[PDB]
Structures are given as C-alpha cells and as structure tokens.
Amino acid sequence: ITIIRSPHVDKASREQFEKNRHKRLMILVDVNQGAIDSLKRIKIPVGVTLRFSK
Amino acid sequence: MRKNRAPKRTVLPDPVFNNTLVTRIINVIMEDGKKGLAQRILYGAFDLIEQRTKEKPLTVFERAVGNVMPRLELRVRRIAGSNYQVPTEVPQDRKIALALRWIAMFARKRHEKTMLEKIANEIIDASNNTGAAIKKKDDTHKMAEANKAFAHMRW
Amino acid sequence: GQKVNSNGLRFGINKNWISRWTANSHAQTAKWLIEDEKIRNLFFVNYRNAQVSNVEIERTQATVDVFVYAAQPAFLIGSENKNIQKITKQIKQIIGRTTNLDLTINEIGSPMLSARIIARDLANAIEARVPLRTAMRQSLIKVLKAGANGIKVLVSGRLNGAEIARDKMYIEGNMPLSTLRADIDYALEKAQTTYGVIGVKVWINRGMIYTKGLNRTPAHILHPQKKQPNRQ
Amino acid sequence: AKKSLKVKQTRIPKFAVRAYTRCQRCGRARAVLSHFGVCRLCFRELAYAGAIPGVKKASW
RNA sequence: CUGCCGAUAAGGUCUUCAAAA
RNA sequence: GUAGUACAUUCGCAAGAAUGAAACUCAAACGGAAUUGACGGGGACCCGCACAAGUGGUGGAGCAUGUUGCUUAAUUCGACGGUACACGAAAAACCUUACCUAGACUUGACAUCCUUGGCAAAAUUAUGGAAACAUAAUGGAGGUUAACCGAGUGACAGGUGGUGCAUGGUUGUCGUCAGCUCGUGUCGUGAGAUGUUGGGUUAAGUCCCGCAACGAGCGCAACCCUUAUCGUUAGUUACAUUGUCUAGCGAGACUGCUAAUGCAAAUUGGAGGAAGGAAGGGAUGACGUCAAAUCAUCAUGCCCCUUAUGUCUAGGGCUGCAAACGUGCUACAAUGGCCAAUACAAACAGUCGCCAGCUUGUAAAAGUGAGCAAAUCUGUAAAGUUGGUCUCAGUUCGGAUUGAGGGCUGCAAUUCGUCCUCAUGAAGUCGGAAUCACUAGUAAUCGCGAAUCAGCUAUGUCGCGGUGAAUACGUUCUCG
Numbered sequence A: 001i002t003i004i005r006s007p008h009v010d011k012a013s014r015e016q017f018e019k020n021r022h023k024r025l026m027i028l029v030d031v032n033q034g035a036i037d038s039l040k041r042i043k044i045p046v047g048v049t050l051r052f053s054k
Numbered sequence B: 001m002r003k004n005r006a007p008k009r010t011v012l013p014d015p016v017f018n019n020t021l022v023t024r025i026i027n028v029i030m031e032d033g034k035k036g037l038a039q040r041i042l043y044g045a046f047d048l049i050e051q052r053t054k055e056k057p058l059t060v061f062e063r064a065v066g067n068v069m070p071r072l073e074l075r076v077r078r079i080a081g082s083n084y085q086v087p088t089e090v091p092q093d094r095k096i097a098l099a100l101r102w103i104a105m106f107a108r109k110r111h112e113k114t115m116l117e118k119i120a121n122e123i124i125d126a127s128n129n130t131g132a133a134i135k136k137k138d139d140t141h142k143m144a145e146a147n148k149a150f151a152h153m154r155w
Numbered sequence C: 001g002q003k004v005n006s007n008g009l010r011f012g013i014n015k016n017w018i019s020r021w022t023a024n025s026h027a028q029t030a031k032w033l034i035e036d037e038k039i040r041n042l043f044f045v046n047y048r049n050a051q052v053s054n055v056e057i058e059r060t061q062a063t064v065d066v067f068v069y070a071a072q073p074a075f076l077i078g079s080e081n082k083n084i085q086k087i088t089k090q091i092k093q094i095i096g097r098t099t100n101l102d103l104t105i106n107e108i109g110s111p112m113l114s115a116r117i118i119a120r121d122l123a124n125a126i127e128a129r130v131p132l133r134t135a136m137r138q139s140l141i142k143v144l145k146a147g148a149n150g151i152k153v154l155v156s157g158r159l160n161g162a163e164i165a166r167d168k169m170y171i172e173g174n175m176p177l178s179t180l181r182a183d184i185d186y187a188l189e190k191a192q193t194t195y196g197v198i199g200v201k202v203w204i205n206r207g208m209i210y211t212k213g214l215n216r217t218p219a220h221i222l223h224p225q226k227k228q229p230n231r232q
Numbered sequence D: 001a002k003k004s005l006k007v008k009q010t011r012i013p014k015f016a017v018r019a020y021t022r023c024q025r026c027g028r029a030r031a032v033l034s035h036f037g038v039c040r041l042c043f044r045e046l047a048y049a050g051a052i053p054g055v056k057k058a059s060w
Numbered sequence E: 001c002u003g004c005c006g007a008u009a010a011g012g013u014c015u016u017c018a019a020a021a
Numbered sequence F: 001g002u003a004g005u006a007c008a009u010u011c012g013c014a015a016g017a018a019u020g021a022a023a024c025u026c027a028a029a030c031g032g033a034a035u036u037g038a039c040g041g042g043g044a045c046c047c048g049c050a051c052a053a054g055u056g057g058u059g060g061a062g063c064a065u066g067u068u069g070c071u072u073a074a075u076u077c078g079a080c081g082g083u084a085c086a087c088g089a090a091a092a093a094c095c096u097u098a099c100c101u102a103g104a105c106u107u108g109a110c111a112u113c114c115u116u117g118g119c120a121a122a123a124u125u126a127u128g129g130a131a132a133c134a135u136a137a138u139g140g141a142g143g144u145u146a147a148c149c150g151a152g153u154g155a156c157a158g159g160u161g162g163u164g165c166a167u168g169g170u171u172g173u174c175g176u177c178a179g180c181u182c183g184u185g186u187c188g189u190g191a192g193a194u195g196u197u198g199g200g201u202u203a204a205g206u207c208c209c210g211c212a213a214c215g216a217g218c219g220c221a222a223c224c225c226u227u228a229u230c231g232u233u234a235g236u237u238a239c240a241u242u243g244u245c246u247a248g249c250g251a252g253a254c255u256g257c258u259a260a261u262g263c264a265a266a267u268u269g270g271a272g273g274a275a276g277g278a279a280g281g282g283a284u285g286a287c288g289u290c291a292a293a294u295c296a297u298c299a300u301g302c303c304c305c306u307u308a309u310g311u312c313u314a315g316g317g318c319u320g321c322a323a324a325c326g327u328g329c330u331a332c333a334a335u336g337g338c339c340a341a342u343a344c345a346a347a348c349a350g351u352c353g354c355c356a357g358c359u360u361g362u363a364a365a366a367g368u369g370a371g372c373a374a375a376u377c378u379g380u381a382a383a384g385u386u387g388g389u390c391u392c393a394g395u396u397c398g399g400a401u402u403g404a405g406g407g408c409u410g411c412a413a414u415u416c417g418u419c420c421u422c423a424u425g426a427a428g429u430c431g432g433a434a435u436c437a438c439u440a441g442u443a444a445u446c447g448c449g450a451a452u453c454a455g456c457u458a459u460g461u462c463g464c465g466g467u468g469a470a471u472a473c474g475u476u477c478u479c480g
C-alpha cells in the first residue's frame, strides 16, 4: 500500500508499506486418536493461522 | 568536473558478414526499440544491392562508409561574439560512428519508396562519392580548411 | 529536515507489534482496529497518575487479552480491588459483552528508561507552570542515573507562554538514530498549557540488541520482578 | 460541518448507491483504504506505532 | 582575451531571566 | 548636515585664494580599528544529466486533465518561481459537498452531567407529499434496565467559520549535499580564534599523517531489505523432458593474495572467482534556512455565530468559456495501415468476486453454468515470426466532431457515466524564438496487474515483465 507522506500537498513524496502472508503446507497421512488427543495440547501462537481441511 | 573516463560496451562481431560495423548501423537505424525490424530492413538492402551492383555487399558497404568517413571535426568555442571554430582530429571510434549517423539521417529523407530501397540507394550512391552524405562531409572539411588559422588555439 | 518515525523505522525488524491479531474479513478488520485504539487511548488519557508505559492487545476469533504495564499499579488496583472493577466495565462496553476479556496488569521494571512515562512526566511539569529549563534537567539527570545511554529531549511549542514559538533540545551521549541495531524507544506527548500546546519528544537509547530476532523478548521489564495479575 | 456527516454515514441511507465509506478513526471522506477502513493519514500514524500487525516498512 | 550586462515600494518580529537546585 | 556656504575684509586683470559663521535640522556620522557571515561581471581547488557527445521528446495540430482570467444564484476551499498547475482529490450524475435556490427543525442529526421512568428504536405497508416530514398501521431484538428508548432539565452540543504571522503534529526545499556543534584547554582587553584550516585518499569532516590542541556528539559509512552463484531442509496445489521452482537456514567477497609506490591510510594492475575494490537497486535525509505548506486529515490558544455561520431533504453547481499557460494521450505513416495463422512473460488480484465452457447476437453483452477462498480454478499478453494486400495519396494515414440504433451499472445517465455498431471524416505531411529527461537492462517502446470504485475518454497514480539502444574527447563556456 502506497501512502502520501504529506498532509496537504506534494503528492511526489509518498512512502510505502508491506504486509507479507507467509504460507506453509503440511499433510498428515494417518493420525488416529493417539495423535489427535495430543494435538489438543499444542497451543498455536495467535499469529499463526490454521486452515485445517480434514 | 568529472575526472573519470566512461567505460565502453562491446561492439559485437556481425552475425552474417562478420563485420562488427553492421551491428552498429543496425542500432543506428533502430526506432521504437525493434531489433528484429531493423535487421530485416538492413539485410533486405544488401539483397537489393546484389540484384543491382552484382558485387559483394560487404565490400560495397565498406567502400561507401569508408568514403563517407570525415577527417576533421569543428568544435564550437564562443568567447565574445559568435563562435570561432576549431578543427580537431576525431578518434577512429567516433569516425565510424559519425559516418553511420549521417548515412541513416540522409537515408530517412530521400524521395524514394520503402526505406529498404531508400537506405539501399544511399549506400550505393555513396560508393561513387556522389550523394547527400558526401556533401555533408565535403562541407565540414571545407569549413575546417577555411578556419585553419584558429586550429592552434583550442582551450 | 524531516525524519522518519524512530519507532516506525524499527518495526518488523527488531521491534514487535503492539497489537497481534488476524481478522476474518475487511469489514471485521476495521472494527477490531479502531476499538483497540480506544482501549489504548483510555488507558493513556485517564488513569495517568499510574505511569502506564505501554498497553498491548491480543485478540482471537472471540477472546480479547490485554497486557498493561505500569510503574505504580496501586492506583489501577485501588482500595481492595475497587478501581479495577470499574475499568473492566469500561473495557467491556467498548468491545462488547459477547466476547471474553482477560485483562492483565503486569508491573514494570526499570521505569525510568522508558520514553513514555518520561514524556508524561515532562508534560505534567510544563502544565504545572514549572520552569522548562529546570524540569528537563532534573528528568535528564535522573534518567542518566538510572543507568542508560544518551537521551534526546525536544520540547517545541509556545515556550513559556511566548508569542513566537521556539524549541529546546538537550542530547547527552551517543544517540545513533541512523543505526538499526540500536534500541531506541520513542514517545511523544502534548502538554496542554493555558497558552496553547507543547510538543515533547523523548528519544532514549537502551543499548545494542546483538541477539537477532523480532524481539519476542521483554524490554526493560526484566531487571526487577514482573508479575501481579487480574488474569484468569 | 464534520460531526453531522459522520453520524449520517453510520446511519443507513434510503438508496444503496447513497452509501459511502468514511474513515472510522477520523472523519476524512476521500482516500479511504477499504482494506483497513482507515484513511491515508491515520494509517501512517497507526503503522508507525505497530497497531496493525505485519505492516512493516518496505525496501522492495 | 577583452560584445553587451540597467533596475528591485514603506514599517516591522524573535530572546524570555537566573533567583537555584 | 547646513558649509568651506553666506556677509564683511585683504590680495588678484580673471578664474579665484585667504578668513569664516549663524538660523534650521538629526541622535547619531559616506566616525576609526578589528571579528563572524554573505556577496564579487576576485583568485585557487573539487563536485552533479550542468555544459559537452548522443537519443527521444515539449513549444505547432486534435483530445484528456489541472490552473489563470471572465461570468454566473453558485461556479466551495486550499496549493502560486526553483519547492504550485494528472496538486490535496487512491474515483464530483444522487451521495460525496464544504457552494447557490428553495421546503422544513431548535438543549437540536450526535454527547456528557444531573431528578426521573421505561411495557423501544428500526424496517416496512397506507394517505398527503420534490423529498425533508407528518398524520394510521405489524408494535416488535431484547432484558426489566444492561446498551439504549425516553420525559424534565439548564450548564450546553454544533461550526469544512477567521487567524499555518499564536501553535502541536506532518511535509517540501537546499540535499543523501557533507556538513553543524559541544566539553576541557590555549591565544585575544573583545566580538572571536583553535580543534573543523596544511599535505595525501575517497561519494563522504572516510581515513592517515602534520599540527596548541586533546576528545566527544549528530550527520557519513556498516548493521536492515532486495537481485546476482552455490550448499543444506521440504516435495504438493510446484516439478514429473526430474531437478527447475518456491522459502527457511547457511556458505560466499574480506583490498583476503600478489606486483608497483607511499611513513600510513590508500590508488592502479593481475590471479582465482557467479560476483573486486560503496557488485546493482531500495529504506535510511544532521543543525538549520525560506515567519516555506497544511486550522479543509486530526488536535488545539484566541476571536466570532448560537430559532443560525448549527441541522434534514429535493433541484442546480463544483463539468461554464472571447481566451493564456503546465503536464500527458493520439497523430501527421510504408521501421506503416488492414486481414489471417501463430510463439514466448513476470507480478498481482479474486466469493455482492474472478468467471472457464456452451447457446444467442455484425458487437458491447445476455442466458445457462461448472471450477476456485486459491503454486490447483479464473483474469485471451502485446510488440515479435510467416503469408496476402495497400504503393506514398491528405490516402486503406489521422481520428476529431456530428446523427441514429443498441449494451452495462445504478432509484436515476438532460445538465454530467462509459462501451459497442453504423454514418461523417476538423486540423495535422515533423512543428518558430526557446526548452526537458536520461550514463544499461538505462533512454525509447509493447503489453499486464492493483489501489480508491455500483459505473466512469484515469490517456492519471502505484507496480510487473517482453524487445532494447547511442554517447561521455574534456571542464573553455553554462546552472547549482
């Protein structure tokens, strides 16, 4: 996103910002309760976002 | 105020007649950044040269371009009123470059038809020292000869 | 000339974000963004006698977590946990009853070398008709005795009620602003004086961070203990 | 004339095309970022304090 | 290495202070 | 200052010489010396697309947009050399909107504080209505008042109203130029000087020497991001012509080695190396100047209005037009116009969306309708290659303007949306004096995507890739 620095005039002076959506994939073959029950105590730090697709 | 001499990019040996100079004139006739178009135009003119002059196109091109090459260069130097000119010996690299620039400039103004025949006619017309590029070279040479006196003072 | 915000130049490299949440949609990204500003402004504008240095906000799909660092948490706590209930109701009205709050006061260490409370103390002194030269010097000497690096204080405004605005700065030590590895904490405050507005800017140098990482580590809260509660 | 326009923007209009987007922090109408609901000069202040997670300065 | 090359309305801020810490 | 002036006197052929005031007027003087800056059509040295060498443009024509002036009920306000003029405005039909004409309101559309109850506001259907708003209806989530719905009620709310010459905050500019200062000490009666100036080296007040100076701070440089080679981890939604590709970590380049010369920093050459001497680009912009810009992002001292400069709505206006300028687009053409076939990208974006395919349509598009919450599905790449044709004409150039018929968005396209089809075919054949940008994937040029957005002659802005040059001898002139 590009935003003009100045309040009123001088459109030429415009700063920039970025926001990166880092992405990873991880596919589990077979889980079973032995893994699933242990999966309940993981506590994922807020920032990370999950897309569980079953 | 710069104290540094600029580098130089390679000239590249031509891909057909293996005569570097062909690539330079290709770049000179370049317009709109079309490498493809320029090669086609130029190459077509050598084929027309074959059909007309019955001689080797590279030899004709050298005989035209080498004949057009000037010797003296007049540099403008104003002091109080107008400019007294100064004849100086131009380097070899600039000699070929200036020759090519004039060849292209008078070629894109001839009364002829498609620039293939236009540019083809200028080079064949310059191999016999009778054309438009020749007159330009003649004029600067005569101007330098007239202004021989101030050649000693340059700056 | 104009300088880039010192805090804003070091965000995402050596400094973490004061609010860490991911919203659902572009409509829910605006509500969750203005609301946290109200909460932070609430803490800062009122409840000032506490020296609140920074308030962080942590939100999930529906659970709001607040981490509030202060130098004197007794005023927030109140008499046998009175003022505390009041602030909870304040926070609930701003975000909504439908969510879950987990406000957490956390007492702070080394309160001096923080540009927020210093600016607040500076602003209070100017509003209290205290002479400007004496006020900055006492704050400067106490901060240096606290055991930090150079501090830069710029106090621009209608100085001493004058009709022509001036500006007074006082650097004392190495304040490398162009350096990224340095830990510079910056804060700005508006001293509301009867003759107008006074802008105070405090640059503090708190050493060099030679451990690479987007922080995730405390900053001048570690030296003494840091606990207390009100959480769940 | 600012406060009345802010209140009117929150209120629903009688036509769908009558609805415009105004900054939620201040009341600026033009140059509003729908991705954040924040105008260009409030987004700078918020970005320089770390309130919006992930908006760091760019080097490209 | 001496071409040429003229003009620019009036009155105005700005240092408050070291008594001292 | 009057003024070496006037009167009187002496000398002189003459011009004049000698002598020599006052009235009036000012708070100082074309006073003296010295200091810090600025300036010089004064020198010495050094820098930058500055000049020079090239390339493509602008000023000429048509069109888009902004500005000056004029007009109007209003053509809202601000920006005005460089540092304003495709600027605020990253979307003016209604809304926006701050302007004008009208129709309506008064502790008010919004808020708190206080005595006091909650057994609502909405939305929508009727009638009158330009719509505001009124009279009637389902009397409404809920939670007993939480929030709000109110009554009573005066403090007051409200102002895009003035002052950016009262300010805070933010920004342009010199300028990414290499500067600006402080502590201690010394010299000088003093302003002040020293360090910071000398000699070498750089992009650099970068460093090394010298040195009544010794040190320090801000700036400079490096630490940050990105591109260029490789190693390691991982192998689906990439690859699957098997090791590309994507993104985590790490290695790599350190004047590290050598030759020359310098005390030393350091300069040049060579070696190896993907990369050599700031390897390319970005973020990063010192004290300060211009009382530079913004009270119309926001906040705020002070002044002004308070049944009106506040508020709601409908219509008009911000789109005018004898004119001038700025920034861009399209051209004046065979390095091209038109038609057919056809190869090769990167980045970004997408569930009121991207929209594949199919059917209809001369077309914009409509209907059906899967797929995709995304390395999976979608957003046709164009220049370029080949073939046919035009044969240099105001034309098969150029598209303006104008008439008609259609499509989309939206209550609504007349003021004032754009697209398609048909019809017409202005000027313009390289543009005067004078000017602008650029030192390689750069200029030039061809497409693609995103932001604000229901839609928008954005040809604007921010990005991505395809093709891809010419020139730099030098500081004599020119600007800083």
Ligand SMILES: [Mg+2]
Pocket: D002
């Ligand atoms: Mg306002």
Ligand SMILES: [Mg+2]
Pocket: E003, E004
């Ligand atoms: Mg003259």
Ligand SMILES: [Mg+2]
Pocket: none
């Ligand atoms: Mg006398």
Ligand SMILES: [Mg+2]
Pocket: none
């Ligand atoms: Mg005199």
Ligand SMILES: [Mg+2]
Pocket: none
């Ligand atoms: Mg002087």
Ligand SMILES: [Mg+2]
Pocket: F052
């Ligand atoms: Mg030139």
Ligand SMILES: [Mg+2]
Pocket: none
């Ligand atoms: Mg023009």
Ligand SMILES: [Mg+2]
Pocket: none
């Ligand atoms: Mg004209």
Ligand SMILES: [Mg+2]
Pocket: none
């Ligand atoms: Mg105007």
Ligand SMILES: [Mg+2]
Pocket: none
């Ligand atoms: Mg002004």
Ligand SMILES: [Mg+2]
Pocket: F083
């Ligand atoms: Mg200006």
Ligand SMILES: [Mg+2]
Pocket: F097
């Ligand atoms: Mg309007």
Ligand SMILES: [Mg+2]
Pocket: F119
């Ligand atoms: Mg009820």
Ligand SMILES: [Mg+2]
Pocket: F118, F144, F145
């Ligand atoms: Mg009750």
Ligand SMILES: [Mg+2]
Pocket: none
């Ligand atoms: Mg006001």
Ligand SMILES: [Mg+2]
Pocket: F164, F291
């Ligand atoms: Mg100003």
